[PDB]
Symmetry: C4
Subunit: 377 residues, 4 copies
Amino acid sequence: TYRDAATALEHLATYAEKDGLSVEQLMGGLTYNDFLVLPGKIDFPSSEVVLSSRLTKKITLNAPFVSSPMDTVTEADMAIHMALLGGIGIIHHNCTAEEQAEMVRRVKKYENPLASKSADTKQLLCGAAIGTIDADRQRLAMLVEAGLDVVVLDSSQGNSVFQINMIKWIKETFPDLQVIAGNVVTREQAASLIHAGADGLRIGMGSGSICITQEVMACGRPQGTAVYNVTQFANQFGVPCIADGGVQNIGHITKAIALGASTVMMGGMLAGTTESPGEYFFRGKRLKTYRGMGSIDAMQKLVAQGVTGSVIDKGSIKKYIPYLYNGLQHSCQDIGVRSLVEFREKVDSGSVRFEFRTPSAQLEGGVHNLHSYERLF
Amino acid sequence: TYRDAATALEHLATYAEKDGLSVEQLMGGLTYNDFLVLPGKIDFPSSEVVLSSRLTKKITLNAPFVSSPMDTVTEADMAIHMALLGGIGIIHHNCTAEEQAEMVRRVKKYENPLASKSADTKQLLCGAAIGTIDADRQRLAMLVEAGLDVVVLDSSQGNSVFQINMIKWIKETFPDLQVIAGNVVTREQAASLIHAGADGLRIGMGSGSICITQEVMACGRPQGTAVYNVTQFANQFGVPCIADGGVQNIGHITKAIALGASTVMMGGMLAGTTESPGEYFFRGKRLKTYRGMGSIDAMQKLVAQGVTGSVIDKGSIKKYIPYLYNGLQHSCQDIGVRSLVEFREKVDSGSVRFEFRTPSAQLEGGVHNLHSYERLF
Amino acid sequence: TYRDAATALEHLATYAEKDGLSVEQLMGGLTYNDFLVLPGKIDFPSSEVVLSSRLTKKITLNAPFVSSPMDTVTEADMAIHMALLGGIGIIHHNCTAEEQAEMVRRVKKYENPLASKSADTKQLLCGAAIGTIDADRQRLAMLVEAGLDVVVLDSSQGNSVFQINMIKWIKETFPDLQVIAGNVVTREQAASLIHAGADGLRIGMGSGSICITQEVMACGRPQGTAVYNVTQFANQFGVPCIADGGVQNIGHITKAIALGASTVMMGGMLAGTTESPGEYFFRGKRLKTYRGMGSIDAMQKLVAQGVTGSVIDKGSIKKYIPYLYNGLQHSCQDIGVRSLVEFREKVDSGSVRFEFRTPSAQLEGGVHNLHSYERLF
Amino acid sequence: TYRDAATALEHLATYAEKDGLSVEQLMGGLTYNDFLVLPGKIDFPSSEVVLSSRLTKKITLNAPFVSSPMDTVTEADMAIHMALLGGIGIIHHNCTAEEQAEMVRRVKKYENPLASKSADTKQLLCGAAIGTIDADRQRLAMLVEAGLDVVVLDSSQGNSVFQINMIKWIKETFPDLQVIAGNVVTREQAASLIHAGADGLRIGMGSGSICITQEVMACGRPQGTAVYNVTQFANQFGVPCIADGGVQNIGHITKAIALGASTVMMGGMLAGTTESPGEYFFRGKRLKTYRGMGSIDAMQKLVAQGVTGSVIDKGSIKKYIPYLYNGLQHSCQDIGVRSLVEFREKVDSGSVRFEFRTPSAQLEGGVHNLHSYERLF
Ligand SMILES: *c1nc2c(ncn2[C@@H]2O[C@H](COP(=O)(O)O)[C@@H](O)[C@H]2O)c(=O)[nH]1
Ligand SMILES: *c1nc2c(ncn2[C@@H]2O[C@H](COP(=O)(O)O)[C@@H](O)[C@H]2O)c(=O)[nH]1
Ligand SMILES: *c1nc2c(ncn2[C@@H]2O[C@H](COP(=O)(O)O)[C@@H](O)[C@H]2O)c(=O)[nH]1
Ligand SMILES: *c1nc2c(ncn2[C@@H]2O[C@H](COP(=O)(O)O)[C@@H](O)[C@H]2O)c(=O)[nH]1
């Protein structure tokens, strides 16, 4: 004797809980590739998915995409086009204060729908990174004069007295300026910098494609676990967090947001693009140099926390960011959420479900058992 | 002092339960390679093993083998020979409705023991895939006129309003037509499509050899876990499920069925065969193109959920399907079951036992510690 | 304030149990490489270690080494020299009954301390494999006439009516003949064949270096778990068990015995030796063919459960078996046991301790972080 | 409604415990790469970090670095420069007693801040290894006459009657001489040698880069677990322990100390340096031979417990040890500890937190997803 098909939806009530795991059940020491999001119910087109995201307490973007402050990723060209496509760029500071201020000016003075713009002047939004030593106070002053919208305090370990004092000084001196503090990977770190007055947090330590901090400092955290534990705390204070490092595809972006991130920062993915700094070279493939700011070369302009490498040409971000945007829309559709806001609410309520992945399951999830294969878009 | 050998069978009663794990104990997020079935008692020849399998509520096959609806796997030639060998083929729809209807006609009009045939006309059984948009209503009408026996609603995420409405429309318009809905990987998805009136379910998301949905959508499920959790629900309603994706050998077929699948769908395994579409080419090995329907090439005839690749020549299925058939018989024999029906009953009663496999155990289970090696059959 | 060194031994009493895990605590689905034995106390030289081992109820060897019944491992030459070095050889049956009987005769008629010899005639001990069909009754009769000491019922799944009847027939017809039944990997299998009257058991399914039974039959068990669970049962009846398959080094032998095996069977390790059948060939390395009896080539003299491969030349066993013997002595010394009998007693009492090994720990345990490396003995 | 940022630090009290795991919670069978230390609070410069370390009960070094007693690592040249840089060298004994005594004399007679020197004569500290057989009594006498400061009883399994008697003999004969016993990996081993009168312990079995003891003896322990369980016992008696083997980078040193080690011993890392014995050779890379003392070559001057290999040129330790020193300072800074003494106290109190690392997390922690990459310092 079999059950009547008409009672199929009702019979779900006989189960203790929904299939798969809630986020809390899921979250030891795992990262993005160690799990999946289970599909939900589709009753809308992907084009309907809204990807509006909080960068800081006062700044909201139309897309959760942020380009990393690295000298092989983000200068004026990257910051301009990232802003035009609904994200934002963080200009690096491996350069003179004069040079950095000039790059900010190029972004703010640029003229030509989802574009990231200031509410008042309708100029493109621009971010910039700085250190937390005394000399950077002057550097920031020059950046602010150039029209800086948001500053990122750049550090591998942001929970320091130096950064705390810098944050306090900025809020007091430049109250209209949004401050993103970091990097952090623990609840205690986040509380410290939130208490200091941070407008946003940057999450990650060692997860970068070119980073080896975990190998030389023995210090860091798996990215997935870091994002979850930090945001679970920080979101209670309305402090948006950037998931920074270890993002290589659309799936990582979805998972980063699922675990509590408001935006995601990318370095390696955008490194090979036309708009990134540095020239192309052949090896017979078209490559661009991509290096950690803690590498000997970058610091040269000593203990290295990063390495110098190369990545394949990815083409222009004018096609690559839309690919990520459309992809994330389709990802949200499969999960059954119409916005990142809804996605956040559904996850915390336990409606969105997750599943672990054994090493075998991970291999199964990718390409396998082929003689050869070639195309993301 | 040692125990008397005569009391050996009786002494088993002193143990709390049988050696190894029941299926429920076994079932986180694992797939086929993560476990094994423990051997049982052999008191019959392998030739006695019956492999009769339910494809849908009303359709039963002599073998649990289904060829996937892909343009590099199943057209008329594949569907004909699959049917002749006791399975069935699902004709792809990456073509005009006219072209697809012609391929169905070729199968139904073909003339020449275990063969899959309609009960009334004794014509070869034929399956076909369609989308769930309005234009497909017309396409299905043409397929039905050509003598279609079963339709597969083709989607990576089948739990949508569009597919639900399509299922309702088909049952109402073509009541004699069997409908397989999918793809699904969760209990909630299955309930939705069963409630809609599905005659069978297609299980899998991201597990395909050419699929990368898990990588770009962050959405899917390990195949083993998906089959178990879906069928544990669906079998209560007498809805047979196809285990689709990640099958590479006879062992995967056995495990798929063990975990609750009624039939298994194969794409990559049948791709390199003579009866599959596409021509052979040399690279110095004989290869055939095998590509996901979500690949840029297939869609071309945009976010790719599949990749284009190649597989080695496997020869004719006239020898390959019998190899799978005989192999599965021997597999059932080792386990100690005389049919797939008995296999299903024994597993759910806890008589058939399972065992996890550590990564070391998996390497041990395959070929290892040789300088070189060569032959499945 | 620190503790007095004089109280160091006494302070161990404050701990709930000894460091590491007992065997029961250790024993899911793991195999040899997944764990280690913890060192004990050395108060004796390695030369004092006795490696006497039970092959069957009535046969004891001076070394726990058995050569596998494969046509690329054991014929007369191997069986003779294995016996001379304190082990035993099992002659394969991929040949006519006449040919097999001749090989046994060569062993028993051979004339020239730890040597394995019959108690009465002082002839070298000899084993031989047979099938369990009717034709093998005649074959066994010819082997017995040639002076066979022990017969191995050769099968990948030994728990069958055919093997059970064969065992009953042999005990009744040739009461003086020792019977080793198998292969088995579960408690239920062992009870069945012990109840039938087996004098020893052969443990393993899929763990062989050339075996792929787990891949095609989905049936088998990780070797470590199989040895433990079978012997934990079988040893209660005084039935010695051979750990067959997956042995590649001295460490595997120690672990096999630790988990309850009385002897270990080797195929791949002895395949490349001078005394094995088959000629050497160059590829620029000296190799010998090594193949599973379930391979197409071996069966040829169809579903393959084994593959044909090659192994590097290992030299003569006149140097290789002493290497294993001395190595196992040193292994026992490190653990702090003076015999395999003591080793068995110490393990079951919980005195010998074990430790799991993460994948990282396994890599650490081998050679790592070198530019290159070369020598077992 | 969001929480007030001012209450961020106070809100931490609502959590049951600190983020991450205490060391006890962390500690199955894992090693260094299986975990990380979570970052703390920085309120000091790295230059302030003190790395003073106990080698034995009476000997303290300014740096926790010890060069291993291997004939491809430490002779007079290495021992001199290790001492000059605040560590110590252990001269190997794969040589005549006369030759070893001469090497010690070269170190003690050498003349030319953090340098490791005797308190009385201000001569460079020098260590030396010996065996535990009768002939070594004479050898030690010659070493002591040459001015030996500390002796290491060299063995893969130090818990033996021979070593116990040697320790007793040395304390009685040369009371002023510091004795390091080992190697050990269990609590029971440590208690035995502490009770015998050891002044320090050497931890490790099989973890060496050139060691294969675990593979051939089946005996050993994952290094991380060994260090923790041994030191948790030994530190109660004020017996410093050397973490010996498996150290490849600064991160391993930090973790070794975190788990309870007082100093770390390095062989492979220092093998390729200018000051190590053996000449350079090209293969087109500059290499030096590095081999285990249990290798056939080393023993030659038989069952091998080590292998012969090669490592890349690392340059002079005059630059490499400062790199490790500065790196470890920065590591301590990130964790938020001002000394190794504080680091030890903070870990045992549960203030320093840890995190597991899945295989995915480990890959993420290193370099990944690059076309190519190059520089530690
Ligand atoms: C450690 N972390 C470093 C370094 N340079 C940059 N970064 C960090 O990694 C992120 C990039 O990660 P991807 O996976 O490439 O996207 C950056 O945003 C930054 O957080 C370094 O040298 N050492
Ligand atoms: C995701 N899944 C895809 C795609 N093309 C086909 N398929 C799915 O995979 C199965 C084939 O799996 P194999 O392991 O090759 O046998 C198909 O039956 C279908 O379910 C794709 O582009 N993206
Ligand atoms: C499955 N098992 C097979 C086959 N030929 C031999 N054997 C089994 O494996 C053992 C050898 O294992 P090694 O790891 O090489 O020492 C044999 O003793 C036997 O039990 C086969 O074709 N399929
Ligand atoms: C086992 N252990 C051996 C052998 N030679 C040296 N050693 C051990 O390994 C340590 C070196 O480890 P690395 O990872 O290279 O730094 C030595 O200090 C010693 O404890 C051997 O032949 N077999």
